[model samples]
Target: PIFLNVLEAIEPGVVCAGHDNNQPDSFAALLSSLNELGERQLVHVVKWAKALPGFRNLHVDDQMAVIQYSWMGLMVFAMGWRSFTNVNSRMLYFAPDLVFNEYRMHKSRMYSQCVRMRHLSQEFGWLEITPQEFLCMKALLLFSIIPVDGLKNQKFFDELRMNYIKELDRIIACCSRRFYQLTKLLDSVQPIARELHQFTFDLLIKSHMVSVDFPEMMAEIISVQVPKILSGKVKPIYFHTQ
Candidate 1:
C-alpha cells in the first residue's frame, strides 16, 4: 500500500518534446527533439529514483550508475504504458507533443523499433495489467541491469532486487503463468532499448554532419555509459535464461 502510494505520488508529470510541429518533418529535427525529450525525462527519472523505496540504500556510485544504465529502458517502458492508456496502443506516444505516426516513425529512421514499441504497448491491453502491477514492474526495471563486473555494492543491490521482486509478487498474489507472462514482458524491453541506444550512439557520432543536436547530458551518457552496454561490458539481467 505504502509503496504503491510512493510510486504513484512520485510518478513524473507529463513531459513534452518541445518539437516544432509546424516545420516539415525531417530526420535531423525529429531526432533533435527526441534527444531533447530524453534530456527532459532524465531529470525526472533521477528524482523519482531517489525517492523510490530502498533506492538510496545502495552505494552512492551504484545509485547513479543504475540510473544511467537503466534510464532508456525505463523511459521506453513508461512510454509504452502511456501509449497503451492514452491512445489504446495505436501509435507511439513518445511524448504528448512527440507522438509517432507511421510517417514520424519513418522520418525518425526508427521504423523497426517503433513497430516493436507499438507491440509492447498492445501487450498492456492484452494482459489487462493493473495500475499497481505497472508501477511495481517499472520499479523492477530500474534494477534489471548492471555492469558485467557488477555494482559497487553488489550485495545490497541483490537484496534490494529481491525485495522489489517480492513486492511484485505481493501485488501479483496471483501465480506462475501470470508471473511468466509478466517476466516475459519485462525481458522484452531490453532489445528495444538496445536498438535505440545503438541508433542514438550512431547519431551522436555524426550529429554535426546530420545537423542534429544532442543535449550535453544525453550526449555524455550515450558516449560513455551506453558504450559499456554495446561492448557487452554491461548486460541486462533477464528473468528467463536462454
Candidate 2:
C-alpha cells in the first residue's frame, strides 16, 4: 500500500512536446520537437527517480548512471501508457500538445518504432494492466539496465532491485496466472527500447545530414551511454532468455 501510494504521488504530470501543430509536419520539425520533449521529460524523470523508495540506497554516482542509462525506456514505456489512457491507443500521445496521428507518425521518420510503441500501448488495454501494475513495472525498468562489469556498489543495487521485484510480487499475489503475462509485458519493452536506441544513435551520428537537432543532454547520453549498450559493454537485464 505504501509503495503504491509513493508511486502514485511521484507520478509525473503532463509534459508537452512544444510542437507547432500549425506548421505543416516535416521530418526535421517532428524529430526536433521529440528531442526537445525528451529533454524536458528527462528533467522530471531525474526528480521522480530520486523520490522513489530505496533509490538513495545506491551510491550517488550509480543513481545518476541508472537514470541516464534507463531514461529512454522509461519514457517509451510511460508514453505507451499515456497513449493507452489518453487516446484509447488510437494515436501516440507523446504529449497532450504533440499527439501523433498516423500522418505525424509517418512524418516523424520513426514510423517502424512508432508502430511497435502503438502495439505496446494496445497491450496495456488488452492485458488489462492496472495503474498499480504499471507503476510497479515502470519502477522495475529503472533497475533493468546496468554496466556489464557492474555498478559501483553492485550488492546494494541487487538488494534494491530485489525489494522492488518483491513489491511487484505482492501486487500480483492474488493471481499466479497474471505473472506470466506481466513478465512477458515487461520483457517486451526492452526490444522497443533497443530499437529506439539504435534509431536515436543513428540520428545523432547523421543529425546534420538529416537536419535534426538533439538537445545537449540527449545527445551526450546517446553518444556515450548508448554506445555501451549497442557495443555489448552494457546490457539490459531481461527476465527471459533472448
Candidate 3:
C-alpha cells in the first residue's frame, strides 16, 4: 500500500512551456524549476525509506549512510519516468509546466547531462515500461544496498536486498531482455546520480547558480548539508541493534 500510494503520487500531471527556448533567463528558469523538482522527489524518497520496516530502526548514522547513497539514484529513477520522447515540440518536459527544447539546452553548461537524459528515454522507448515495472525499479533503487562504511547489520541487509531484488526480478520476468536491458541501463546510471549529489551542492550551495534562494529543506536534502568525506563526519560505528 505504501509503494502503491507513492507510485501514484509520483505519476501526477504535466505542462509544456515554450519559454525554455528563451535567454540566460531561460537557462536559470529551468534550473530553478529543476531545483524544486529535485528536492520534491527527495521528500518522497525519504518517505519511502522511512516506510521500510528496519531502515529507520537502523542506527542513526546507518540510516543517514544508506539513504544518502540511495536518494539520488531513486530520484534519477523517478525523473526518468517523466522523460518521454514522443512529442513534436522537440522538447523534454522537466515538469508538467517546465520544459526545455534540446536545441535550447546547448546554451547551458549542463547540456551534456540533458542530452543523456534524451538518450535515456529514447532508448527505453522500445520497451513497454508498465506501472509494475517502474514500481519495481523504485523499490530496487531504495532497498538495494551495498556495504557502506559504518553501516550495521550487513547480514540483515544482504538478505533484505536479496529478497527485494528477487521481487523486482520477478516483475521483470514476463518481458524480454529489454526488461533486463533497461534495468541494466538503470544500473549504469545509478552512479552518475551519486555524482549529481555533489554537483547539486556545488550548483546550488557553493556556486549560487540560482535566481532565488533555496529553502533550508531543499539545501539539506541536496547534499546532507555537507559531504561526509570533506567534513570527516565519519559514521559512528554502528552496533547491531537487532
Candidate 4:
C-alpha cells in the first residue's frame, strides 16, 4: 500500500518536457518516492513474516531461517536491475534469456558474497576500516577494470564505456555457465527460468529509461545533495504525517 502510494505520487503528469530534462526538484522528488516505497516494502515484509503461523511459532533458529529466506527473496526482486544492468553493460546488448540467467546466477553469488563479507568483517572488526577504505575494497571486488586516474580522467570514462560493452559479452557467457550449474545443483527447486524471463521483460518495459520522467533531474539532485549530506555541509530532515 505504501509502495502503491509512493508510485502514484511520482507517476502522474507527463508534460511536453521529457523526464530527461534533469531538474533538481524532479530528481529529489523521485528519490523521495523511491525511499518511501522501500521503507513501506520493508515494513510490510516484517509484518507478513510475523503473521505467518509457522514463523510465529518457530524457535529462534527457525525464525532466523525464515527471515533469511524471506530476505533472499526480497533481494532477488530488488537486485534484479543491478544484475540486469551489470550483464547488459558487459554484453553491450540485451537479451531476455541472458538477463534472466544473469539474475539467477548473480542472485546466488550475491547471497554467498554477503555471507562471506559478514564473516570476514566480524572477524576483522570491520568498523576499524574507514569508509573510503571499505569502498575501495568493494570497488576492486566488483569490477576488475579500474580507472588509471581514479575516475577523474576523460579517458577513464571512455574506457569504462567501451569496457561495459565488452563486459556484456563476458557476462552472457558467465551467466550461461552458471545457469547450467544452478540447474544441476538445484534441480529439485522449481525452475524459475520462465518466471525470471517474464519478470525481466516486464522490468524492461517499466524501466526508468522507458517510462519514468525526470531521471536527469533526480540524478542532478543526487550528485549535489549526496556530497553535501556526506560532508556535513547540509543536515538531513525527517518528516512524519500525523
lDDT of 4: 0.31
> How many Å off is the CA of 44 in candidate 2?
0.4
TM values, all candidates? 0.98, 0.98, 0.71, 0.22
lDDT of 2 by residue, 7-86 (tens): 99999999888889889899999999999999999999999999999999999999999999999889999999989998
lDDT of 1 by residue, 114-177 (tens): 9999999999999999989999999999999899998999999999999999999988994787
Predictions ranked by TM-score, top down? 1, 2, 3, 4
Candidate 2 segments exceeding 4 Å error: none
For each candidate, the alpha-carbon lDDT, in order, equals 0.93, 0.93, 0.57, 0.31
Q: Determine which window of 10 residues in candidate 1 has minimal summed lDDT.
A: 85-94
Give the runs in model 4 whose Cα sits over 4 Å from its true position: 1-27, 51-53, 60-242
Candidate 2: how many backbone clashes? Answer: 0
Model 1 ranges off by over 4 Å? none
- Stretch of 10 with least lDDT, candidate 3: 233-242
The local lDDT score (0 to 100) that residue 193 gets in candidate 4 is 21
